[PDB]
Scaffold this motif. Structure first.
Motif, PDB file in Angstrom:
ATOM      1  N   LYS A   1       0.742  -1.114  -0.052  1.00 47.87           N
ATOM      2  CA  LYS A   1       0.103  -0.066  -0.036  1.00 47.87           C
ATOM      3  C   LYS A   1       1.064   1.252  -0.060  1.00 47.87           C
ATOM      4  CE  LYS A   1      -3.313  -1.594   2.530  1.00 47.87           C
ATOM      5  NZ  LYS A   1      -4.500  -1.914   3.330  1.00 47.87           N
ATOM      6  N   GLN A   2       1.659   1.395   1.011  1.00 42.91           N
ATOM      7  CA  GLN A   2       2.562   2.603   1.251  1.00 42.91           C
ATOM      8  C   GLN A   2       2.840   3.116  -0.241  1.00 42.91           C
ATOM      9  OE1 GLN A   2       1.830  -0.669   2.738  1.00 42.91           O
ATOM     10  NE2 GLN A   2       1.620   1.164   3.838  1.00 42.91           N
ATOM     11  N   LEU A   3       3.794   2.068  -0.841  1.00 44.51           N
ATOM     12  CA  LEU A   3       4.419   2.435  -2.219  1.00 44.51           C
ATOM     13  C   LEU A   3       3.334   3.577  -2.828  1.00 44.51           C
ATOM     14  CD1 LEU A   3       5.941  -1.017  -3.029  1.00 44.51           C
ATOM     15  CD2 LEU A   3       6.789   0.852  -1.452  1.00 44.51           C
ATOM     16  N   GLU A   4       2.107   2.994  -2.685  1.00 44.54           N
ATOM     17  CA  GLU A   4       1.133   3.791  -3.546  1.00 44.54           C
ATOM     18  C   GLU A   4       0.418   5.217  -2.636  1.00 44.54           C
ATOM     19  OE1 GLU A   4      -1.165   0.025  -3.950  1.00 44.54           O
ATOM     20  OE2 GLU A   4      -2.696   0.929  -2.688  1.00 44.54           O
ATOM     21  N   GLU A   5       0.029   4.771  -1.460  1.00 38.28           N
ATOM     22  CA  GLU A   5      -0.588   5.744  -0.581  1.00 38.28           C
ATOM     23  C   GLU A   5       0.447   6.698   0.018  1.00 38.28           C
ATOM     24  OE1 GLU A   5      -1.351   4.494   3.670  1.00 38.28           O
ATOM     25  OE2 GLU A   5      -3.376   5.623   3.594  1.00 38.28           O
ATOM     26  N   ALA A   6       1.677   6.268  -0.265  1.00 38.02           N
ATOM     27  CA  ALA A   6       2.811   7.087   0.187  1.00 38.02           C
ATOM     28  C   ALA A   6       3.287   7.969  -1.083  1.00 38.02           C
ATOM     29  CB  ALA A   6       3.966   6.472   0.946  1.00 38.02           C
TER      30      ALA A   6
ATOM     31  N   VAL B   1      11.162   5.914  -1.164  1.00 34.74           N
ATOM     32  CA  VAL B   1      10.253   6.677  -2.467  1.00 34.74           C
ATOM     33  C   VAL B   1      10.572   8.075  -2.235  1.00 34.74           C
ATOM     34  CG1 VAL B   1       7.627   7.140  -2.565  1.00 34.74           C
ATOM     35  CG2 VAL B   1       8.639   5.175  -1.735  1.00 34.74           C
ATOM     36  N   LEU B   2      10.595   8.762  -1.135  1.00 35.65           N
ATOM     37  CA  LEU B   2      10.982  10.334  -1.384  1.00 35.65           C
ATOM     38  C   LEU B   2      12.469  10.523  -1.987  1.00 35.65           C
ATOM     39  CD1 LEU B   2      11.640  12.630   1.635  1.00 35.65           C
ATOM     40  CD2 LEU B   2      12.985  12.610  -0.319  1.00 35.65           C
ATOM     41  N   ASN B   3      13.206   9.773  -2.074  1.00 37.39           N
ATOM     42  CA  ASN B   3      14.781   9.927  -2.836  1.00 37.39           C
ATOM     43  C   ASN B   3      14.333   9.768  -4.218  1.00 37.39           C
ATOM     44  OD1 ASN B   3      16.999   9.865  -0.762  1.00 37.39           O
ATOM     45  ND2 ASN B   3      17.793   9.393  -2.648  1.00 37.39           N
TER      46      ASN B   3
END
Ligand SMILES: [Mg+2]
Ligand SMILES: [Mg+2]
Ligand SMILES: [Mg+2]
Ligand SMILES: [Mg+2]
Ligand SMILES: [Mg+2]
Ligand SMILES: [Mg+2]
Ligand SMILES: [Mg+2]
Length: 71
Positions: free
Chosen positions: A7-12, A62-64
């Motif tokens: 999820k994160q990978l998406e929701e984030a 992900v932020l990188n």
RNA sequence: AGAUGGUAAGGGCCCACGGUGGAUGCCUCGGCACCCGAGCCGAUGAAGGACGUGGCUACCUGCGAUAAGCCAGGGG
């Protein structure tokens, strides 16, 4: 966890830099909160710690990728 | 008046059984040799290291403050 992980990978992924850095700050504190308990015993569900340590790794990962062009 | 048995503090040899010690035999995650294959790395910071990294971790391995791991594709 595998599921609640994809999820994160998406929701984030869909948020941006200023949204994550703050999210990550939040997580980092939660991690402190943890390691802070064990030292006294309380917390023992280790799985939680390592589980949170790796979450941050993802948000940062992900932020990188976002900070390399975008807008 | 005569006499050669006999005592074993210990010792010696033979046997039996143990203790010690790790030869011998079988073993092999290892080395040796030859023959193929493949053959460079670095300031995009090398080789090699220091320190750190696990819920509790002395050391080794793996990693680097995203720290026995993070993202994605492929195999299973
Ligand atoms: Mg006599
Ligand atoms: Mg005697
Ligand atoms: Mg022995
Ligand atoms: Mg190096
Ligand atoms: Mg180490
Ligand atoms: Mg500790
Ligand atoms: Mg896969």
């Amino acid at each position: 966890k595998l599921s609640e992980v994809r999820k994160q990978l998406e929701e984030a992924r869909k948020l941006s830099p200023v949204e994550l850095e703050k999210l990550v700050r939040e997580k980092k504190r939660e991690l402190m909160e943890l390691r802070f308990q064990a030292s006294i015993g309380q917390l023992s569900q280790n799985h939680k710690i390592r589980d949170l340590k790796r979450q941050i790794a993802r948000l940062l990962t992900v932020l990188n990728e976002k900070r390399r062009q975008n807008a």
